[PDB]
Write a protein that binds this ligand. Structure first.
Ligand code: OV2
Ligand code: OV2
Lengths: 204, 244, 233, 196, 244, 243, 222, 249
């Protein structure tokens, strides 16, 4: 009935000292039925990482779409899409379907290749840009994530440290949600390199 | 090379639309007609060439009415003049629909005017082969107009076009001088019969029928109305008594 | 001269003529002769039919439009089919919406206005047919003449087609006679037969050659062919 | 809303309250419900704020275009334009409009256009939620060919009763006077009209 | 009407040739020469700009070489204006394909579609053809390295080595004389330079007049790489072969 | 070798002959016009020739009231003239409705000149054989004169003149502004600016004028209007007292 | 939201809070509800967040192209007419509630627009769920002929009424000042009366707290 | 109705596109304009040829702003330029700013303009545009750039060039004077001297139009508040600012 509530899944992004982190759970279900423990919710286009929660067909579409749009961008501009700019392409793309929206909750994370500035952003289903310095949350357990982050978060965390904080935020939030979990993955982003870790969590 | 007269919208090197000037020739070949504006109304008249004894009298009407207060008569290609009135009739009805009030004559003129100008703008259309004399009584007094194939139109004290346009105007100009303080509606009808009969010298080989109409605040109550029976016979008898 | 001003109906000649319309008129003069004539009670059509061989049929020249109105053709047959059909709808519309028998005078104004739109627009050729329309509306008996220029004329009697000038001088001569033929259909049909043979030259009009139509006061529009016209030969 | 327009010897006068509401909250207490569509043709607006504004803006446009071409429009013409918009879009509009204008030939003229899209020409017209309460008063008081002083009083007394009884009416009483002399704007504050 | 001014761009000659296709091909034979050579371990694209000026900017310029795709690239001969319109659909088309099949478009399917767009302007619509010839250089998991050509007619063909633009007859014979199958990429690099150097209508063949590209699969990365040579790189490779 | 003169496409020399022949059309009426700026007004003067004794003099006009503020004078044949007017009026009304403020003179001009350019590029449209002169007292730029042609060109003027005998009026005015130093007519009232314009029309053309030979338009703060034969007559009595 | 607009002697000031919500949960604790239309026309937005941000941009983009076409400074009435006609067209389905103000060659202006497309004019205006809390302050302290500093104070005070008293309002106060002869000044975070108190504890986990299953390096190069 | 659904530019037996060749002829007949690119700025300049001593030269701008960081100048037909500028401004919003919330890079807005001109080469019932344009701009990732756009739709990047009448002699003059170490003040100095060879009449800030793409102008923005907004890089010089460099020239 609620398209945002059929498949499940959560996403969280978090900034630190010269770093960003983006994270998601692996669950794809239909109501009570757990169907796939592999369904990843993070994607990247060059150095710009996007996460999407919501109705999974829309997640899958919007992926393909933003790959289509970034590919064409990079060919015309002869340079990779930047987080600030990408954020704007996501907003106008969603609002284009204002009165028949994609049932999604996109999240943008990355590091401006020119300025070296860490960047995260959040959206609603119709492309309202929610820009934050600390953290962004999305999905069926956003409430649990909001409480987790607001408490656990402190600014200027080191790459190693930030990993611990974001993982413990996601895990404890997913364990109070019936439709999130089943595995998990956390991207740690630096200006030069990106590190991807799978987490060990409850499988119920 | 030239060939500037082969396509409508084109300008000649002297800045003319040759196709329009060629349409004027069709009008000049047409049967003569006039309009006399008077001190409270307008009087229209026209020549009807009787080819055969087989043409029914009073039956082949040429003066058309747009709305209830306007009337139109034309020289040149009849079917074009009919088409111009169909547009006139739509245009006036559309104006009455939105603004309640019947269309003022100056407003109606510009409507036909912008429509005729439109057919001198594109190669895919032919210019109208008619001059049209039209007018009536509106919110402020009488109005009389003449519309050319180019789209040109002005207000007239007297208007004339067609085969006998020469004789008519020469007779119209004597009226404007001999009656400076306005002519009456009744007088103009009689005087319209004379003008048609005297402009029939230009074609005095074939017999003709006479067709008159008038729109006059005090005589026809401001509505366009044809001249019938006793008033018509009265106007014929005046032309006969003036031609002799 | 004429070479450059006859490519389409959109173009005027320097004299002010529309050659495409005028060539369409020529198609009528090549057509088979047909005649109309009326009194106060009845209106009549008489038409000569033209065959290809003595193995072919004589193609029909008269068409019904409604129970009080119809017409005869001279020129292109397909164009008569288009034009008669139209008047059939315009007669039909008047009936269904206004419960009204569409008057023959407005019949002509509709044909005049339809024909005119073909003479001003690019691409559209003029129609290539002339029509003799007879009716009986709320104002007695009527007969109309239609030229593909647009000019429609209410007449007592007239002819169109090949050699049709002979029939037209006859009707012009015997006006005072045929107009007073009121109450007797036969002596109006017989007046229309004597008209059309004034336009004959080569052949004698036969039983499958002649076509007669009548409308009037106590008679509706009907078609007479075959041994049903044998009495008028 | 409470609104009215009244013809008199010298011309015509329009009157209105100044309250707009969303339910029981007053959105604006100083609203001008008296709107110019032409120099000497005005209207009274009641119903939807959005609808009546959008309609009036279009009428002003149509009359402006009419003026470029045909000169000064009659009041009847201004009514016809309103009528056309209201009638033809009756399903999508909640708008009740009183059209008032001064012509130098026709003197004063008032046309009323209720929800249906019908037009009614009257010596005076009242409308708006608050008008119901003043039907009795107006019928028993109104006379033809009153003076300007007299008509301003008649409107002042009527709208004060409407404001007194109807919760959807209030603020100041705005008037607009239309005569050969020109256009006059009048305002009357609570402390004045409540005491009547 | 407009009939008079219609060139009729999509008709046959009495010979059975398409006038406009032929005249457009004549246009291309005047444009700068482009060369494509395909080797065993990669493909080479090179082109010569017509003559230009010193003032002209060479760093920002990339006028005859274009990236259609991650793995497909093109050399242009003809109007750049026309070429970009087509290059933009070609890019959109590949993306559409990727969005649908989640696989990069096979080189021929891309080529065919453009050539079908070209064929269109040849058969209907009464518009002029695109004055453009393309060389295509790409890779896919089916045929590996591919080299195609397409001209205004909508016809396309596959080649081991090819030229479009000016002096193609002279350039084709020179390739047909020095090309062999077991060629290395860096051998094909030399051939393309020598060939252009022998058909050049200018005095000397300098770096500022050249554009260069390779679609070589990395002998260490083990996946397909595109490289558009930057002025400095061309300057270096031109001294190697012995042209200074 | 022929048709590059019939539709709006380039000649070998780079010229558009249909545009050039349209300019020629603007002089068909044989009527001259001029426009000058005052302190806080703008005056258009055009010749009024009524050669036929059967015409109604009051209907013969090449001056139009486009809006409450803008007026337009046309050098060209009347049907093209009235075409251009109707559009200008529609374009003016629409601007006001859409943007909530009266259309400026220079903006209306640009628009009508952008439209004219279109007929210069598309083939099925002919250009209009008219030169349009717009006048107002713009609420931002003060007194204004802007003129458009069949080429699609437009520019702002200190003063201007148009028609067969244009150069006579032009040189006359050029010499006045070199003498006076300023770029307008230094006068308080519009009445004395209308007098100036008629005076310089007579001194440049070399012909006297009666009340029926002239047609006047005046633009003031928030108002454009045309003078009746009588207001002109009053203005002609005033000029024949100084001399 | 809470949003207000106050006219003073030489111009107009507009102000807004910075709370953004999704149901009972605060989405953004610091978003900008003030929108540049042109340099000297700014706009306060309440209602559907993406609706206000998008209609602001569409019109701002149109107003910029108009200003170039006409070579004139944009007028507040233009932006007002375009917004209302657009909103009206959508019969209120675009839920943007706007206070639009600024200066132009015709003076200083202050307006309001509702989602259904109606417009009000005034010297003091407020919209949003905090409308009533703020309007109470405006009705109590507004006088005619305000100085610039008095206008800021009043508008700032009105937004505070919403922040404290309305649950759909909070965090900071954003102000923008548009004066007749000057360049409009945008005061982002003019007041910050809701700074979060320093946490009692630190929750930095001892490294290795989280159990890892699989590790890899991601690739961006090409 | 539009019966012109067929091309008006077609190929002639020789391979020439007649209408384009002719459009280019019209560009040679037009008044000279030029453009020069320094290390820290770009300058575009042209001559204001006046139709009448009565016309006001201010009301006609041959140099136009397209975006805050991009300017355009031309040689050829003025009306065609004007409508191109209108479309160039619009396209920069619809196809870019309304998508990315920033302005298009110089090379991409050129590309869009080129396309608009190319369609005039091929669409039914239109002649090509009779103008060559010079576009000067800046973007964060490309630096400063100068482009030339021909009636065909083609575009070339330039260190310096001129178009129109004395373009041949002016290009020769620029080749002498241009280097890769120029400051923007120098580029203006050359521009004034290069334009002096074209102009017969009065040579001052009243008859010469000149604009630059230089540093960000904070005082031309119209508002303060956003730290990431620093003002336009396009600046048109005033009549007075031109005369200042002509007094010592
Ligand atoms: C009287 C105040 C009584 O309603 C007037 O008629 C007045 C008309 C003037 C011209 C504004 N009407 C209003 O103030 C209306 C009242 C509601 C109404 O009549 N409707 C049909 C909507 N108020 C509005 O139009 C307000 N907009 C709304 O959408 C009403 C909200 C109602 C809650 C669902 C605007 C003033 C904002
Ligand atoms: C006050 C905070 C009142 O809520 C403001 O008006 C504020 C406006 C600014 C521009 C953020 N409004 C919101 O934050 C609204 C309030 C929700 C609302 O208006 N509803 C009751 C629906 N919130 C949003 O706009 C949020 N979006 C959504 O909830 C999705 C709506 C989809 C419509 C189909 C975003 C802030 C996330």
């Amino acid at each position: 009935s609620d398209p945002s509530s059929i498949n499940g899944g959560i996403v969280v992004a978090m900034t630190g000292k010269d770093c960003v982190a983006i994270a998601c759970d692996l669950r794809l279900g239909s109501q009570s039925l757990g169907v796939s423990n592999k369904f990843e919710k993070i994607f990247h286009y060059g150095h710009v990482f996007l996460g999407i929660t919501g109705l999974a067909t829309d997640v899958t579409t919007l992926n393909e779409m933003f790959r289509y749009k970034t590919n064409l961008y990079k060919l015309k501009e002869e340079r990779a899409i930047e987080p600030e700019t990408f954020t704007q392409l996501v907003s106008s793309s969603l609002y284009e379907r204002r009165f028949g929206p994609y049932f999604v909750g996109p999240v943008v994370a990355g590091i401006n290749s020119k300025s070296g500035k860490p960047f995260i952003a959040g959206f609603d289903l119709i492309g309202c840009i929610d820009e934050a310095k600390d953290f962004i949350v999305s999905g069926t357990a956003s409430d649990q994530l909001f409480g987790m982050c607001e408490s656990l978060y402190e600014p200027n965390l080191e790459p190693e440290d930030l990993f611990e904080t974001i993982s413990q935020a996601l895990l404890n939030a997913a364990d109070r949600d019936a439709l999130s979990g089943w595995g998990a993955v956390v991207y740690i982003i630096k200006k030069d390199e990106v590190v991807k870790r799978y987490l060990k969590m409850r499988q119920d | 090379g030239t060939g500037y007269d082969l396509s409508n919208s084109v300008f000649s090197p002297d800045g003319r639309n040759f196709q329009v000037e060629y349409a004027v020739k069709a009008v000049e070949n047409g049967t003569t007609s006039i309009g006399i504006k008077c001190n409270d109304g307008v009087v229209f008249a026209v020549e009807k060439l009787i080819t055969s004894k087989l043409l029914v009298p009073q039956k082949n009407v040429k003066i058309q009415v747009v709305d209830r207060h306007i009337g139109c008569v034309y020289s040149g290609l009849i079917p074009d003049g009919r088409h111009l009135v169909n547009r006139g009739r739509e245009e006036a009805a559309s104006f009455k629909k939105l603004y309640k009030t019947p269309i003022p004559i100056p407003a109606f003129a510009d409507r036909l005017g912008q429509y005729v100008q439109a057919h001198t703008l594109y190669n895919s259309v032919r210019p109208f082969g008619v001059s049209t004399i039209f007018g009536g009584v509106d919110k402020n007094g009488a109005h009389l107009y003449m519309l050319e194939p180019s789209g040109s139109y002005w207000g007239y004290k007297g208007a004339a076009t067609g085969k006998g346009r020469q004789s008519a105007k020469a007779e119209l100009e004597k009226l404007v001088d001999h009656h400076p303080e306005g002519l009456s509606a009744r007088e103009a009808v009689k005087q319209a019969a004379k003008i048609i009969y005297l402009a029939h010298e230009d074609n005095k080989e074939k017999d003709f029928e006479l067709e008159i109409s008038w729109c006059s605040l005090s005589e026809t109550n401001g509505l366009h109305k044809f001249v019938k029976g006793d008033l018509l016979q009265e106007a014929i008898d005046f032309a006969q008594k003036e031609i002799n | 001269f004429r070479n450059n001003y006859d490519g389409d109906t959109v173009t005027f000649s320097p004299t002010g003529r529309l050659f495409q319309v005028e060539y369409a008129l020529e198609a009528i003069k090549q057509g088979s002769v047909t005649v109309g004539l009326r009194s106060n009670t009845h209106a009549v059509l008489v038409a000569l039919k033209r065959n290809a061989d003595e193995l072919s049929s004589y193609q029909k020249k008269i068409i019904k439009c409604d129970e009080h109105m119809g017409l005869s053709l001279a020129g292109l047959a397909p164009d008569a089919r288009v034009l008669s059909n139209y008047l059939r709808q315009q007669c039909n519309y008047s009936s269904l919406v206004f419960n009204r028998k569409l008057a023959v005078e407005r019949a002509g104004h509709l044909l005049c206005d339809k024909a005119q739109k073909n003479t001003q627009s690019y691409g559209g050729r003029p129609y290539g047919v002339g029509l003799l329309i007879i009716g009986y509306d709320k104002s007695g008996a009527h007969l109309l003449e239609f030229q593909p220029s647009g000019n429609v004329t209410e007449l007592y009697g007239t002819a169109i087609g090949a050699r049709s000038q002979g029939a037209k001088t006859y009707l012009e001569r015997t006006l005072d006679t045929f107009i007073k033929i009121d109450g007797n259909p036969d002596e109006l049909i017989k007046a229309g037969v004597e008209a059309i043979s004034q336009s004959l030259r080569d052949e004698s009009l036969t039983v499958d050659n002649l076509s007669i139509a009548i409308v009037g006061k106590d008679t509706p529009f009907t078609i007479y062919d075959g041994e049903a016209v044998a009495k008028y030969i | 809303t409470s609104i009215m327009a009244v013809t008199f010897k010298d011309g015509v006068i329009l009157g209105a309250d100044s309250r707009t509401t969303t339910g029981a909250y007053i959105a604006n207490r100083v609203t001008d419900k008296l709107t110019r569509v032409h120099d000497k043709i005005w209207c009274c607006r009641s119903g939807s704020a959005a609808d009546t504004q959008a309609i009036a803006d279009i009428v002003q446009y149509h009359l402006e275009l009419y003026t470029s071409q045909y000169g000064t429009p009659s009041t009847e013409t201004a009514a016809s334009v309103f009528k056309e918009l209201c009638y033809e879009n009756k399903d999508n509009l909640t708008a009740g409009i009183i059209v008032a204008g001064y012509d130098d030939k026709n003197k004063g003229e008032v046309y009323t256009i209720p929800l249906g899209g019908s037009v009614h020409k009257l010596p005076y017209a009242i409308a708006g939620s608050g008008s119901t309460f003043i039907y009795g008063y107006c019928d028993k008081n109104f006379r033809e060919n009153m003076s300007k002083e007299e008509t301003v009083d008649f409107i002042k007394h009527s709208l004060s009763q409407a404001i007194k009884w109807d919760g959807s009416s209030g603020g100041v009483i705005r008037m607009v006077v239309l005569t050969a002399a020109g256009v006059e704007r009048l305002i009357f504050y609570p402390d004045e009209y409540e005491q009547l | 009407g407009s009939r008079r001014y219609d060139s009729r761009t999509t008709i046959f000659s009495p010979e059975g040739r398409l006038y406009q296709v032929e005249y457009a091909l004549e246009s291309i034979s005047h444009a700068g020469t482009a060369i494509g050579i395909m080797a065993s371990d990669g493909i080479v694209l090179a082109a010569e700009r017509k003559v230009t000026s010193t003032l002209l900017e060479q760093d920002t310029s990339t006028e005859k070489l274009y990236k259609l795709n991650d793995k497909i690239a093109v050399a242009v001969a003809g109007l750049t204006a026309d070429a970009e319109i087509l290059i933009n659909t070609a890019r959109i088309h590949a993306q559409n394909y990727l969005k649908t099949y989640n696989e990069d478009i096979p080189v021929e399917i891309l080529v065919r579609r453009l050539s079908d767009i070209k064929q269109g302007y040849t058969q209907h619509g009464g518009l002029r053809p695109f004055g453009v010839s393309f060389i295509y250089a790409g890779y896919d998991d089916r045929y590996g390295y591919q080299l195609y050509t397409s001209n205004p007619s909508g016809n396309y063909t596959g080649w081991k080595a090819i030229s479009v633009g000016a002096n193609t007859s002279a350039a084709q014979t020179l390739l047909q004389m020095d090309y062999k199958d077991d060629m290395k990429v860096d051998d094909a690099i030399e051939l393309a330079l020598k060939t252009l150097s022998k058909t050049t209508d200018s005095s000397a063949l300098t770096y500022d007049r050249l554009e260069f590209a390779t679609i070589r699969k990395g002998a260490n990365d083990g996946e397909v790489y595109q490289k558009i040579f930057k002025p400095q790189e061309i300057k270096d490779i031109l001294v190697k072969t012995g042209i200074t | 070798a022929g048709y590059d003169r019939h539709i709006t496409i380039f000649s070998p020399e780079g010229r558009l002959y249909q545009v050039e022949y349209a300019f020629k059309a603007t002089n068909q009426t044989n009527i001259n016009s001029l426009a000058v700026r005052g302190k806080d007004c703008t005056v258009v003067i055009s010749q009024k020739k009524v050669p036929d004794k059967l015409l109604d003099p009051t209907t013969v006009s090449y001056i139009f009231c486009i809006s409450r503020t803008i007026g337009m004078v046309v050098n060209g044949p009347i049907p093209d003239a009235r075409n251009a007017a109707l559009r200008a009026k529609a374009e003016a009304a629409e601007f006001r409705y859409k943007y909530g403020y009266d259309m400026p003179c220079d903006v209306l001009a640009k628009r009508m000149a952008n439209l004219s350019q279109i007929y210069t590029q598309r083939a099925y449209m002919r250009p209009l054989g008219v030169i349009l002169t717009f006048v107002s007292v713009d609420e931002e730029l003060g007194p204004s004169i802007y003129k458009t042609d069949p080429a699609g060109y437009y520019v702002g003027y200190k003063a201007t003149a148009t028609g067969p005998k244009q150069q006579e009026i032009t040189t006359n005015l050029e010499n006045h502004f070199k003498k006076s130093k300023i770029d307008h007519i230094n006068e308080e009232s519009w009445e004395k600016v209308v007098e100036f314009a008629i005076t310089h029309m007579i001194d440049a053309l070399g012909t006297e004028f009666s009340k029926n030979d002239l047609e006047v338009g005046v633009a003031t703060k928030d108002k454009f209007f045309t003078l009746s034969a009588e207001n002109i007559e009053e203005r002609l009595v005033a000029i024949a007292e100084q001399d | 939201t809470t949003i207000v607009g106050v006219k003073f002697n030489n111009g107009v000031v507009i102000a807004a809070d910075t709370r953004s919500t999704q149901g009972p949960i605060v989405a953004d604790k610091n978003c900008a509800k003030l929108h540049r239309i042109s340099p000297k026309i700014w706009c306060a937005g309440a209602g559907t967040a993406a609706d206000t941000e998008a209609v602001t941009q569409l019109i701002g983009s149109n107003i910029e192209l108009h200003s170039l076409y006409t070579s004139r400074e944009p007028r507040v009435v233009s932006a007002l007419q375009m917004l209302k006609q657009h909103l009206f067209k959508y019969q209120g389905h675009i839920g943007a509630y706007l206070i639009v103000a600024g200066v132009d060659p015709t003076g200083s202006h202050l307006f309001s627009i509702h989602a259904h497309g109606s417009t009000d004019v005034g010297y003091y205006l407020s919209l949003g769920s905090g409308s009533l809390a703020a309007m109470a302050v405006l009705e109590s302290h507004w006088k005619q002929d305000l100085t610039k500093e008095e206008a800021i104070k009043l508008a700032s005070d009105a937004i505070q009424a919403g922040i404290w008293n309305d649950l759909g309002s909070g965090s900071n106060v954003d102000v923008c000042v548009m004066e007749i002869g000057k360049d409009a000044e945008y005061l982002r975070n003019y007041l910050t009366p809701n700074v979060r108190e320093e946490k009692q504890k630190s929750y930095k986990f001892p490294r290795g707290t989280t159990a890892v299953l699989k590790e890899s390096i991601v690739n961006i190069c090409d | 109705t539009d019966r012109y659904s067929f091309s008006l530019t077609t190929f002639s037996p020789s391979g020439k596109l007649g209408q384009i060749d002719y459009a280019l002829t019209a560009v040679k007949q037009g008044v000279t304009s030029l453009g020069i690119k320094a290390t820290n700025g770009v300058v575009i300049a042209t001559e204001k040829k006046s139709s009448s001593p009565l016309a006001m030269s201010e009301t006609l701008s041959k140099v136009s702003l397209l975006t805050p960081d991009i300017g355009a100048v031309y040689s050829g037909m003025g009306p065609d330029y004007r409508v191109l500028v209108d479309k160039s401004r619009k396209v920069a919003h619809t196809s870019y700013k309304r998508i990315y919330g920033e302005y298009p890079p110089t090379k991409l807005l050129v590309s869009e303009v080129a396309k608009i001109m190319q369609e005039a080469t091929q669409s039914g019932g239109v002649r090509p545009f009779g103008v060559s344009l010079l576009i000067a701009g800046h973007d964060e990732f490309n630096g400063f750039s100068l482009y030339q756009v021909d009636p065909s739709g083609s575009y070339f990047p330039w260190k310096a060039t001129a178009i129109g009448k004395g373009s041949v002699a002016a290009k020769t003059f620029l080749e002498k004077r241009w280097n890769d170490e120029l400051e923007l003040e120098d580029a203006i100095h050359i521009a004034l001297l290069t334009l002096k060879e074209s102009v017969e009449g009065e040579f001052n800030g009243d008859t010469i139009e000149l604009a630059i793409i230089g540093d960000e102008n904070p005082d031309l923005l119209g508002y303060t508040g956003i730290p990431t907004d620093k003002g336009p890089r396009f600046r048109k010089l005033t009549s007075q600012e031109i005369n200042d460099r002509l007094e010592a020239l």
